[PDB]
Amino acid sequence: MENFQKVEKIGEGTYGVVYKARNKLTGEVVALKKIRVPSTAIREISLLKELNHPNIVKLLDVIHTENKLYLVFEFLHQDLKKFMDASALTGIPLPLIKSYLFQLLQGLAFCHSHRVLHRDLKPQNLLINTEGAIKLADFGLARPVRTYTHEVVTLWYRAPEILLGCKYYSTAVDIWSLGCIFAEMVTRRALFPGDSEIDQLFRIFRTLGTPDEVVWPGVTSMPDYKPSFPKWARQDFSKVVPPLDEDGRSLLSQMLHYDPNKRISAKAALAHPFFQDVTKPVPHL
Ligand SMILES: Cc1ccc(N(CC#N)c2cc(Nc3ccc(OC[C@H](O)CN(C)C)cc3)ncn2)c(Br)c1
Predict the structure, then answer these.
(1) Residue 214 Rama label (left phi>0; alpha psi -120 to 50; beta)
(2) What is catalyzed by this enzyme?
(3) Do residue 209 and residue 178 come from a single domain?
């Protein structure tokens, strides 16, 4: 750590506090995360230093000293959450929303091709720069209910299979989360703001319809599925994300399919007609 000087507190991350810091030597400005060490952790983390992509926050170095773990990441000046809030009254322009979704799908396609899942995608761990790029952060660190600061972990972006107690979820969980983020960027309001696991599940059911064996084979046998779940009817996406166009609604619907196996893959989503006219606009930061 002596090689680093803490500039400011970036925020209380899920696995520890994060500080903007400078390499007392290289002058490099980075994001320093102190992880709240098992050999299994070290090996997995070392594997992440290899997962390099333009849309994945670069893990610069892993420091294992004094039996403590520090992760040094590339530094970006803001997360998507702050940007969405700052664009609340005007709304993020569609071309930029399209650009961000496109880039994130590229990042996911990359990770997923390497069999790596994010598992906890949310606006707070999506970082943007002044150039128009957006990157996935804290990728692979998943493999708690509260943070080290007791802060509640958001359930708003959790896939239904996870909520239903699935133990071996797939890359499909990341597509679901991104779909929820996509919808939020368009409407300027969280799609499923649950404040408990059951409230989260029921919010999803109230919008997409209570899942059954027809739309999701095997759902009634899932760990936490209850035959007593209320049966709500499905609503039109025309009502869910106006004024998103049909290409956009088509894509969002495929990203929010109940059956993880039916849910569109990142790579297939990249070929969706919605991205026919994709561009890379510069954000107003
Ligand atoms: C909650 C949290 C804490 C740390 C990070 N990590 C780690 C990784 N991987 C960063 C951040 C960063 N830059 C930056 C990120 C946020 C930020 O402000 C966050 C505020 O908390 C905004 N909120 C209102 C959402 C300022 C600079 N550059 C590289 N890595 C992330 Br992702 C989320």
Answers:
(1) alpha
(2) L-seryl-[protein] + ATP = O-phospho-L-seryl-[protein] + ADP + H(+); L-threonyl-[protein] + ATP = O-phospho-L-threonyl-[protein] + ADP + H(+)
(3) yes
- CATH of residue 11's domain is 3.30.200.20
CB-based contact 95:279 (threshold 8 Å): yes
Q: Do 228 and 278 touch, CB atoms closer than 8 A? A: no
Report the nearest-CA residue for atom 33 of ligand 1: 125
Q: Which amino acid is at 224?
A: D
Considering the domain architecture, whether residues 47 and 144 belong to the same structural domain is answered as no
- Domain boundary residue among 12, 44, 77? 77
Point out the annotated binding site for ATP: 10-18, 33, 74-76, 79, 122-125, 138
Which position has the token pair 């150039």?
A: 131
Resolution of this entry in Å?
A: 1.9
Locate the ligand 1 atom nearest the alpha carbon of residue 125 and give its number.
32
State if residue 79 touches ligand 1 by the CB under 6 angstroms criterion: yes
Which CATH number characterizes residue 109's domain? 1.10.510.10
Cite the annotated binding site by residue number. Answer: 10-18, 33, 74-76, 79, 122-125, 138
Experimental method used, please? X-ray
Atom of ligand 1 at shortest range from CA of 141: 9
CA–CA separation, 251 vs 276, rounded Å?
12
Structural domain of residue 32, as residue ranges? Answer: 1-77
Ligand 1 centre distance from Cα of residue 252 (Å):
26
Distance CA 103, CA 116 (A): 17
